[PDB]
C-alpha cells in the first residue's frame, strides 16, 4: 500500500518546480487496512477518524453509497452525512439516529434517491447541498470492482476537505502501487467535531453478481504530519513525490532539492540521543515548619487571645494535616488543599482561636460579617485556608466556658487582620467607648459548650493559615521526593535545582568538603555531589553529531550507507546487521551492519 494518496495541497499552484511542504499526508509504505468483505464476512463497522483518512474502494455502481462522519453519528450532536443518489452527491449536517445498518434512506420528491436529497429524517439540518452528476462519474467506467474510487478526507479549521481520483483496477480485492494525484472537490464549512465515521452500503447487495455480492473491498489509511517534496510539471500537474521521512536516501534527496544525486558524501541532519529516564535527588529531610505551636496547643487561644505568626525557611507537613482524620471541617479559599501538600511559597501567615460550633459559618477567607469582622478576620489576598477541630471534648465547659467568650463587636474596625480582637466595650462606629458607661457596649456571651450540648453549640478550635506567592525565593515548600540514581545512561536529572540532561557517571574527581559541584574550564558544570549519598558524580552530555549519507550516483544505484559522525557505535541503533539494507522507516532512519572509524560510526 504505497504512492497512493497525494493531493494538491491547496489552490495556489504553479509550474515546473520542486516544492517541499508539510501536511497531513499518507506516509509512503504505511499499512492500509483492507476490509476484504464477503457475505458472512460482512457489516459496516464504525471506524475512528483520527487526524483524517485516505479512503478507497473497488467500485463502479456506487456500491459504497456514502459516508457518515461525526463524534457519535447517532445521538445528540450534529453529524455530516454524504450520500450518492444515483445521479449525484447529497450532503447534510443533521443529527441522524442510525441505530442499525443505516436505512433511514427517505428522500425529497423531485427524482427521489436519484436527484433530490436523501436521509431527511433528523432534527438540525443547518447545512444541505445538492451536487450535479457526482455518482454518474463513478458509473461511467466499465464494470464494478474493475475501478478504484480513491479519496482523502481531512478535517481542520472547521472545514472538511474532500479530495478524489478515480482509476482502473485488475484485481477486485487489491490496492495497486500505481502513483496518482487526487483533485480537491469540497472545502465544506460545517464545523463538526469528527472523531468517528462509517461507510454506507444502505442495505445493498449488488446485482453485479461476483459472489451474490453482500460484498466488496474498501481500504482505510491514516494521514500523518509529514514533509513531502512534490514535483510539478509545465502544466502545473504533480508528477512525482518524495516522503522525506521514509529512509536515508529520501531524506538526502529532499535535503538536496533534487530527484537525482551524484556519487559523494552529504551532510543531512543531526543525531541526538533521547533520555531513557529521570533522576531527582534532594538532601536529608530537615527544617520542618513550626505548625505544632499554631495547630497543637493543648488548650487553644480564645477569640481575643488569638495566637498569630508568620513562618519561613521550612518544609511544610501540610500533606499529613490534609491526610488527618481529625478536623471537623477544613476549606481553602486559595489554591486547592490537595496541592498545598506539595506547593511552594515565599512565606505563610498563620493563627488559631475558638468558636461556638454555629459561628464557624463566618470565619473563612472569602467570608465577612459582624462575627468575624470583630475578632480575627484576615485579608482575602493570601492563599488562605481554614481548619476546625473539637473544642467540645477538651477546652469547653458544660456551662459554656466563660473564659472562651464570644466575639467582641466593634463596628468601626474596617481593616483586615485588625478586625477588632480586643476585650473592650467598643461596639459602635465612633462613640466614646470607655469601660461600661451608657455611651458604649460589649457582647460577652460564652462560646465553649461541652459535647453533650446540641450539635449547633458543639464548639471548634480553629486554625487559619495563609500562604504568600511572590517572584522572590520560595522559603516554604511541602516535602520533595528523591528517586533512585541511574548511572551510565542518558537521563534527565535534578540536584538541588541544578537541572539538566546528561550521562551521570561515578568519578575520581576529588573536591573539598564545602564544595557542591565542579565547573570546568568552559565554566559549564561537569560534576556534582549527590545530596543524599555524598557520592561524587561526573556529568557528560548525551551523544550527538552530524549524520552523513554516502552514496554512489542514484543513476547507478539506490543503495546508501550512513555515517554517524564522532559517536561510538555502542550508542548507535538497536540495529539488524545486514549489509546494503537500512530498516530505516522504523529504525533511526538507518538500522543495519556496523563498522567503527575515527570519523564516527
Amino acid at each position, epitope marked *: 500500500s504505497s504512492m497512493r494518496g497525494v493531493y494538491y495541497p491547496d489552490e495556489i499552484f504553479r509550474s515546473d518546480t520542486l516544492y517541499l511542504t508539510q501536511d497531513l499526508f499518507l506516509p509512503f509504505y504505511s499499512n492500509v487496512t483492507g476490509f476484504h468483505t464477503i457475505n458472512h464476512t460482512f457489516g459496516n463497522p464504525v471506524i475512528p477518524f483520527k487526524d483524517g483518512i485516505y479512503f478507497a474502494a473497488t467500485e463502479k455502481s456506487n456500491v459504497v453509497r456514502g459516508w457518515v462522519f461525526g463524534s457519535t453519528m447517532n445521538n445528540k450532536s450534529q453529524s455530516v452525512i454524504i450520500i450518492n443518489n444515483s445521479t449525484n452527491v447529497v450532503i447534510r449536517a443533521c443529527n441522524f439516529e442510525l441505530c442499525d445498518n443505516p436505512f433511514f434512506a427517505v428522500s425529497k420528491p423531485m427524482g427521489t434517491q436519484t436527484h433530490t436529497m436523501i436521509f431527511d429524517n433528523a432534527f438540525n439540518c443547518t447545512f444541505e447541498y445538492i451536487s450535479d452528476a457526482f455518482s454518474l462519474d463513478v458509473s461511467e467506467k466499465s464494470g464494478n470492482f474493475k475501478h478504484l474510487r480513491e479519496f482523502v478526507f481531512k478535517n481542520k479549521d472547521g472545514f472538511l476537505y474532500v479530495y478524489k481520483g478515480y482509476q482502473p483496477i485488475d484485481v477486485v480485492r487489491d490496492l495497486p502501487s500505481g502513483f496518482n494525484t487526487l483533485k480537491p472537490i469540497f472545502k465544506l464549512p460545517l464545523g463538526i467535531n469528527i472523531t468517528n465515521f462509517r461507510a454506507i452500503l444502505t442495505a445493498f447487495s449488488p446485482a453485479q453478481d461476483i459472489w451474490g455480492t453482500s460484498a466488496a473491498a474498501y481500504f482505510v489509511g491514516y494521514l500523518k504530519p509529514t514533509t513531502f517534496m512534490l514535483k510539478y510539471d509545465e502544466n502545473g500537474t504533480i508528477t512525482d513525490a518524495v516522503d522525506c521521512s521514509q529512509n536515508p536516501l529520501a531524506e538526502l534527496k529532499c535535503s538536496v532539492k533534487s530527484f537525482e544525486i551524484d556519487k559523494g558524501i552529504y551532510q543531512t541532519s543531526n543525531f541526538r540521543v533521547v533520555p531513557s529516564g529521570d533522576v531527582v535527588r534532594f538532601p536529608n529531610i530537615t527544617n520542618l515548619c513550626p505548625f505544632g505551636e499554631v495547630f497543637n496547643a493543648t488548650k487553644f487561644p480564645s477569640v481575643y487571645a488569638w495566637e498569630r505568626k508568620k513562618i519561613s525557611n521550612c518544609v511544610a507537613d501540610y500533606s499529613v494535616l*490534609y491526610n488527618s*482524620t*481529625f*478536623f*471537623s*471541617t*477544613f*476549606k*481553602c*479559599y486559595g489554591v*486547592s*488543599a*490537595t496541592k498545598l501538600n506539595d506547593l511552594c511559597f515565599s512565606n505563610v501567615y498563620a493563627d488559631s482561636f475558638v468558636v461556638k*460550633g*454555629d459561628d*464557624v*459559618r*463566618q*470565619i*473563612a477567607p*472569602g*467570608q*465577612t*460579617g*459582624v*462575627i*468575624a469582622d470583630y475578632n480575627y478576620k484576615l485579608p482575602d489576598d493570601f492563599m488562605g485556608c*481554614v481548619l*476546625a477541630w473539637n473544642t467540645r471534648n477538651i477546652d469547653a465547659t458544660s456551662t459554656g466556658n466563660y473564659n472562651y467568650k464570644y466575639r467582641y463587636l466593634r463596628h468601626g474596625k474596617l481593616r483586615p487582620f485588625e478586625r477588632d480582637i480586643s476585650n473592650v466595650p467598643f461596639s459602635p462606629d465612633g462613640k466614646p467607648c470607655t469601660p461600661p458607661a451608657l455611651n458604649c457596649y460589649w457582647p460577652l456571651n460564652d462560646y465553649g459548650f461541652y*459535647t*453533650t450540648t*446540641g*450539635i*449547633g*453549640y*458543639q464548639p471548634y478550635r480553629v486554625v487559619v493559615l495563609s500562604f504568600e506567592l511572590l517572584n522572590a525565593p520560595a522559603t516554604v515548600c511541602g516535602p520533595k521526593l528523591s528517586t533512585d540514581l541511574i548511572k551510565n545512561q542518558c537521563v534527565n536529572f535534578n540536584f538541588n535545582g541544578l537541572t539538566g540532561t546528561g550521562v551521570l557517571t561515578p568519578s575520581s574527581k576529588r573536591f573539598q568538603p564545602f564544595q557542591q559541584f565542579g565547573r570546568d574550564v568552559s565554566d559549564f558544570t561537569d560534576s556534582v555531589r549527590d545530596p543524599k549519598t555524598s557520592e561524587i558524580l561526573d556529568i557528560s552530555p548525551c551523544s550527538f553529531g552530524g549524520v552523513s549519507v554516502i552514496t554512489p550516483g542514484t543513476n547507478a544505484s539506490s543503495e546508501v550507507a550512513v555515517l554517524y559522525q564522532d559517536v561510538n557505535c555502542t550508542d548507535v541503533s538497536t540495529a539488524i546487521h545486514a549489509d546494503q539494507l537500512t530498516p530505516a522507516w522504523r529504525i533511526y532512519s538507518t538500522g543495519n551492519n556496523v563498522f567503527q572509524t575515527q570519523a564516527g560510526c
Partner: antibody
Amino acid sequence: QVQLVQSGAEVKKPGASVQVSCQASANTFTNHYIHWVRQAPGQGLEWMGIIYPTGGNTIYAQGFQGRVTMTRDTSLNTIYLELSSLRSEDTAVYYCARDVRVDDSWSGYDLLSGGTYFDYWGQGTLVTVSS
Amino acid sequence: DIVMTQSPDSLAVSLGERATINCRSSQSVLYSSNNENYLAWYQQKPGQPPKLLIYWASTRESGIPDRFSGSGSGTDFTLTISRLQAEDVAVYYCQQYYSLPRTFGQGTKVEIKR
C-alpha cells in the same frame, strides 16, 4: 449529587450492636458532610449524627454518638453502621444523607457552611427495637 | 438545636384548605454574612434522609409539592400545607442548609380534617 442508595433495615436488640448499608459519591460525602439517618422511620431520618465517609471525620448528639455510630464502607464510597447500645434511637431509618450542594469553589472537608440535610437521598430503609 | 424541628408532628388541612407546616430552629438563621437565611423546607416521605426542597424558605423549590412550603422567619417558620391528606402530605419541616450540624427533624406527617 452522590451515587445515593440506602439499605440494611434491621431490628436492634436492647443494649446490642447496630448495623446498616449505603452508597455515595462526590461533594455529598467529601465537601459537605453526609448525615447519619438518626430518627425513627415513622418520620424523616433527622441528622443527629454527621459524617465524612471520604475521611472518617464525624460529629454527633451523645445518644447517636453510640446508637448510630458509623464507619466508611469504602467499596460504596459511603457509610455503613457500626453502632452500640441499641434501642429506640438505634431504630432510626437505615439511611445516609448525601449532603447539601457545595457552598463554594472550596476544597477538602469544607462544610463550615451548607447542611447535612440531603441534596441527594438514598430512599432509606426501616428499623425498630428488637425487644 | 440546628436540626430544625416541626411543631405539628402531623398536618390538619381540609380538602383543598390552606393549613400550615409550623416549625422552629436554633439561632441566627438569618445570618449577617449570607442574608438569604439558612432554613429551607424538607418535603419528602418518612424513612428517607430529610432532603432540602424549598431553599431560603419563601416558596417551594423544584420537586416540592408547591402547596407544602412558604414563609420562614429566623428561629421560626410557617410554610403552606394545603390539602395535607395529599400533596403537602409528603412529610415536611423546616431544615438547615446552615453548616456541618444542619438538618430537618422528624417532619410533619400527612394528615387532614375528617
